[PDB]
Symmetry: D2
Subunit: 509 residues, 4 copies
């Protein structure tokens, strides 16, 4: 798991890996020159007793006031302490890891004027699997994610706390595990740490990875449902999608053709396989899942760029000798990317729920009502369908956009903000909702196919069936339903179906 | 502390108490007649070989078919098992208790035809402080809260699991704690347990109780903020509110006058107290908070009725010998009550946030910028304000209504539902958001008052100052900020400020 | 139509009539003393050279500075002219009248310090049916409906324009139609006219009247649909609704029983009336429409009061000789009331849409597919149903609440506002959507009942059938569909079915 | 204006031109072979008495049943008549034009099996500027825009009505104007006309064009606002945006640099140009407007493809001799493109409002309060600002996604739909809101720059001042404000500032 980072070149697949599992990283040697050059430029500005806002200038009245080196050193600590004003649930370690790596990535490009040694400290925490406490809420994604990044930065100073092996350690305990001792920040370093969009970006990246996972599961589940109700393959005909010209849809049908094949034992099992027209939940899968693929591709485009962005402030341009203040802390693009992903995740679940609904209806599924025999006496999947409906509906309200709101802070200087952290975070729960729907679709279609005694579907959809049946049995007589849904959900969360989808379809896969 | 329950007569204050703390209850002697008559009618139907859907009919083709009663018993168990298809986090014990008591309340009115012994089993679990596991999601609040209620009912059967003294026990161990053994259900009892609106109702009642808590706190917090910035008392003059005629606003201004009084040491400290106009976030508090009061009163009224409703189906009318199938499981009124509460919770937070923003602006507060001295190098409350902004903004999307959505379930027999569980559960997080804003407002105004060296506000507001300062000190120089927010939040959560509000203002207080 | 106004006592029924048609009004003689005393108190303040903000002070630098009387009058003009900065479509005459009468109503209570003669001028425009141009957008309902009330007030000054007999006139031409000459305003008079919540309130009252109209039509439409698909009357049994205890639902089922009766020739046409269970869209009509009724009642309570409110600023209390600045211009209660009404109008239409969907499904309706004979070649109501689905869906997004948003204006002086105008005006379009759905249900049910050859429904529902068939014939063979829907909508808009409803059920009826 | 249409190759710039103004078009000679082959494939299927769904089968019972050719002509008429079930206001002529051209473009690709004469008829109507009546609402954008396209198609049959020179004519008169006589449709032709996404796509393309128009105006307005308050040009430094890597932001800052230049007479007027820090509303224009550019680009990509799509059903593949039923009538990609455009239009307006708020604040603008001198008695821009706040706030609710909603229609065969028409049409009003805000910003910045006596801004920004000042004078003393806003809005609407923006930035420009 050893990543040698060339700053600014992380790929979405690399980000997914960093999000998914611990990492051992090292900065590429070629990053050192620009990083050290940046610090040298700050050191010269101060050595020449020059005044540079964000570098050695104070605040408010002192904003046009050079600062005594002792006080400059002190100002750093005070900024981090006061800015660590976040609240709510701790982030989990995988997400904290991602955030730390994005900050390392950005700092290591050499425009922030921070000492290499502080970057090395963050790298050491990551390699040691020591994860600073970071509370979920507080950032508005403008100037940066000041509070969550400040909470992160506390551990560096020997403040706050960090998790190691699932247990909270004091910063000193935690630093020691990393082979570190508390740091003392210099000019510009507090700002270099607290400014930026890494929390916002990390929140949205997890939303993306979830959206991708659910896309991949939905193609396999949708394939099984088609098979379970003896659906047609004609909706996936390449000529249909070429004639439309929508690329998400073209690629989506291609995926369906890949998992389903030209036919199967089960589909060959009935004289007529298309005779009657299929419902839209089946027949329009390429169009709807195609619209979702494009959506998440559009988001991923924006987020993969932001993961490599230089997002602090002000920026140090050592090549010019320049220090400049811009607005890259404003995470507006991130906020809209998260609101875009919301549409994708919601509609993936909505279509799956209608496929479940379809399999529940005797007049449409060519299956026993509620997917069970002895129907007078058994309810079978009846309430599972209800749970799917509850989950799906939830996503309509959750899809309301956060990127359209803003409140001015600090006497109207921060007078427009992105609300990107909120946008990204709601995607995690929408993904839980859509994950439960798909898990119930999975259960339904596999039950259904079982009822077409001994008949098999395609090679990849048989693997999908086998993966489920490894944990949950055919539903005979009524039994406690919930645990089956729990197991299906966990399987999906573990990416059990992801490997079935053709590679290079999804942005980070 | 012993509740002697006359079914159908629980008050909002009793409901708050059950939600807040354990309960010991017993049915009033006057309850037996209706209960016994109800069961007798069901027994008579079955004895008279009569057919009654929901009593002794099977399902589907058997909807119009009497069932071999021995099969009838099994049907009850199959219903509970298959209907227990809920998903998500376990509800906490306080909410399970409330749900159980609501179901006891309803069944004990004598329209459900259930055996007293089954009510008694539930009463024993409550009194033994044994709380069946109930998953958060699944119900759409139409037919009833089938999934959460079935999970609850599993324990009665010796299935599922229950929490005791904070630990999960097997159903049989749990039952034994309560002095019970597994039950065998009889005719209509499965449906009597599963149908109804008790989960939805419980969810929205927790939402009301939080909304009331936050209202009370906001009156005190807003009172401190007025004093901190040397605001006027003129906006609260009773003649202003009488001339408008809105009762929420009239009662709200009366509370403000109660807590602030006609003047205080602090207010008498400045020559002019009204000369200049105060901003709307001050001047319009009775108008905005009064609107919120009304909204939560409108909701309280609906939920207080629903807490005493007979909500299962079909209903047994012993007096006429009738069993009738209706739609009382449809929780539409609860769903709209919860969406109504959302507006209150959001606007209480929005107004507090603007009061916070006011306190940060030197040109508005007559206080040091960001409420701290040594401004050159100290940020003070600067990021806490941002956090307040993030929390409040979140509430805008969260207030999108759930009561306006619906999906047809079970082959379109259940073709319209309420989505009340979703509506009420989101209030809990909205309340965390607003609670956070108010904690920061509380922190700001006490800080700000502190800077008016040695001056006191009114008798009640000084107690509010006292409560906080017992956990969180005055902010001198920048320090780790978040722990102070945590502490103020917890204080608020514990109802530290609720007692300051005058009697008989809030529905359940 | 002569209304003799006793200010502050208008009823919801009186407000409906004013909204519905031209009015001829006059002030009750008993109102003169308080109005005249209010003016004298202002004149005394001015004469005693006392300084009163809102009365004789300028603005900003002059806000606490008396102004030369010559300027005092000029100030009045500049306020109206500068404040008339609204935009968008002209309000129609009915709404302009409502707003005018509301401002007459509030001014006439004698707390505003305005000359009776200006009130008289307004009354004169109303009675002459001369309606000032007022643009739709601009107000945020905080301080008042400043822009729309400024536009209205222009005409009093001989500025702006007014509609008479459907044509725009110059203000001078317009004034002369009303027997008036351009007015010159005195101290406090500009604020008295522009401050207040009359535009917000008028917008929300029209939404209420619409919601009410749609409620009544939905009871009759719901009743026809029950008859068309041979649904049961049992869901309306009074005992069911009594047992729940919700007053809206109790009253709603009373209405259904009123129009349906115990039975009908059609209902008696089919052996079984309860055998099979009705779909929720039928069976839960009392529960859903009852929730809607409660909502619109809760809204009505708040708006009927606001219609009688004294909402300008500052307020003059001649009895004490006091002038007070308060926040009555903040229309938060009206904004929440409108957001509440949104839930009602949306859910009335959602339930209707589902009933339409039921009538289209041969497996549920017991009617030919799509309600026409010769289905192999006729599409019948197939696309009309789609149109109803489009209309219902729109209302989900339109139901997003406006009362949860705010932007600070006037340098954070007006730092919290209500957005009530936006909240109320969207209700008109939501009503248009729900009216379309109901129109299509009406057409559907009458068609379906026609197919029950010669069978009659109840006496009031046959009246419903007759009202439609007088304009729209039975659908034999496919024909241009749209003109049918247009006619049904227009019929509903004109209240063709409102008279069927029992009196005293809806707030203004 | 003579377009020679090569089917499937329309560019966004061509689509803009078609939306903006009348067109004379002709089919390229290259289109005939495929058009003719498709028809011939259809005619041969019928001549061989083979059975083809959507070609020669009836409906319902006849779903698998050929039709007597005479009846086949009748079935086409019945389809158009019954499907013309739309409702609401008439679309404007420009939009009807765009729809007709899109339908011609699609049919002309030769996959629909429609006679060239039917295409020629639509082309004739377009060339004659005869515009069939089409009602705004009814379509759910799945199967197609059946209702609006049927309404359009009526005229072809000698039914319905059409607008010519602003007047409604009967279909036959309209047809005569185009040199036509009523047509009789052949097999599959009704479906070929009614199926597809042309209405959906036309509605969203107008939103895109509006969004673009407002982007362009916003750069010029934002530029004037920077100059008016003496803002810095440093935020636009290319190195800042290069370091982030976002292309939308890069292109946007480039645009700001183009319009502003390195400096101006006004900017050189003040010693310091960056000294003081600018608010986010200024400083973060590249970041926020860049995110908006990206959003509309992502939508334009999808819509550009969709304007050229083959979207009816079923499709005729003459090459193979195949007729296939697919889901291209499902307009999901268009629904999401519209919801995406909503975020852009909202945030452009939001940023514009905050710049207006900045300009009103004397502590922030370095200009007189409310942009007027003699402030004691003049209110100046004070209420214009409130109007902008109202408009901007409206867009938050309107931004709620429509693409996340769906209802099953037509007996559960159309069980998932896109709601693309609603999604696109809400953009038109959101653009009116944002246009109003930008108009007010324009007025304010020019007012303000005027107050920097005699000083000029950049070459392009002076043209912007000139454009406005040609219709609206400097604001001296308070005056009727609204007409100035109307005039500014009209100027913007006519594209007055669009030409200032560098070429190659916006998708259709």
């Amino acid at each position: 798991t050893e990543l040698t980072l060339k700053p600014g070149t992380l790929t979405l697949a690399q980000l997914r890996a960093i999000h998914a599992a611990p990492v051992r990283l090292q900065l590429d040697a070629s990053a050192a020159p620009a990083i050290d050059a940046s610090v040298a430029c700050v050191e010269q500005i101060i050595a020449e007793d020059r005044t540079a806002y964000g570098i050695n200038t104070g605040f408010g009245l002192l904003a046009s006031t050079r600062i005594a080196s002792h006080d400059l050193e002190n100002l750093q600590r005070s900024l981090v302490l006061s800015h660590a004003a976040g609240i709510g649930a701790p982030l989990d370690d995988d997400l904290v890891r991602l955030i730390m790596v994005l900050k390392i990535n950005s700092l290591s490009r050499g425009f922030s004027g921070i000492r290499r040694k502080v970057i090395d400290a963050l790298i050491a925490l990551v390699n040691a699997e020591v994860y600073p406490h970071i509370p979920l809420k507080g950032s508005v994604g403008a100037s940066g994610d000041l509070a969550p990044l400040a909470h992160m930065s506390l551990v560096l100073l020997g403040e706050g706390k960090a998790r190691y092996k699932g247990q909270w350690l004091s910063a000193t305990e935690a630093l020691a595990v990393a082979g570190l001792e508390p740091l003392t920040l210099a000019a510009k370093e507090g700002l270099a740490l607290l400014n930026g969009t890494q929390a916002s970006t990390a929140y949205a990246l997890r939303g993306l990875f979830y959206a991708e996972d659910l896309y991949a599961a939905a193609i396999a589940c949708g394939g099984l449902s088609v098979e379970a109700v003896l659906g047609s393959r004609s909706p996936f005909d390449a000529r249909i999608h070429e004639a439309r010209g929508q690329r998400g849809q073209i690629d989506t049908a291609a995926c369906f053709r890949d998992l389903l094949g030209d036919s199967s034992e089960v589909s060959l099992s009935h004289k007529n396989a298309d005779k009657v027209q299929d419902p839209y939940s089946l027949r329009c899968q390429p169009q709807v899942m195609g619209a979702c693929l494009t959506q998440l591709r559009q988001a991923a485009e924006v987020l993969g760029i932001e993961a490599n962005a230089v997002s602090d402030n002000p920026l140090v341009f050592a090549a010019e000798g320049d220090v400049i203040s811009g607005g890259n802390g404003h995470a507006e693009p991130v906020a809209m990317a998260a609101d875009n992903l919301a549409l994708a995740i919601a509609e993936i679940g909505s279509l799956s729920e209608r496929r479940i609904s379809l399999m529940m209806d005797k007049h449409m599924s060519q299956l026993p009502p509620f997917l069970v025999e002895n129907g007078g006496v058994n309810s079978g999947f009846m309430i599972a369908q209800v749970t799917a409906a509850a989950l799906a509906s939830e996503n309509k309200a959750l899809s309301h956009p956060h990127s359209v709101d803003s409140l001015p802070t600090s006497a109207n200087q921060e007078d427009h903000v992105s609300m990107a952290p909120a946008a990204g975070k709601r995607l995690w729960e929408m993904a839980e909702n859509t994950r439960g729907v798909l898990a119930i679709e999975w259960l339904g279609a596999c039950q259904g196919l079982d009822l077409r005694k001994g008949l098999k579907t395609s090679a990849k959809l048989e693997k999908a069936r086998q993966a489920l049946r490894s944990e949950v049995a055919h539903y005979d007589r009524d039994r406690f339903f919930a645990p089956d849904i729990e197991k299906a959900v966990e399987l999906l969360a573990k990416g059990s179906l992801t490997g079935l989808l053709p590679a290079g379809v999804l942005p980070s896969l």
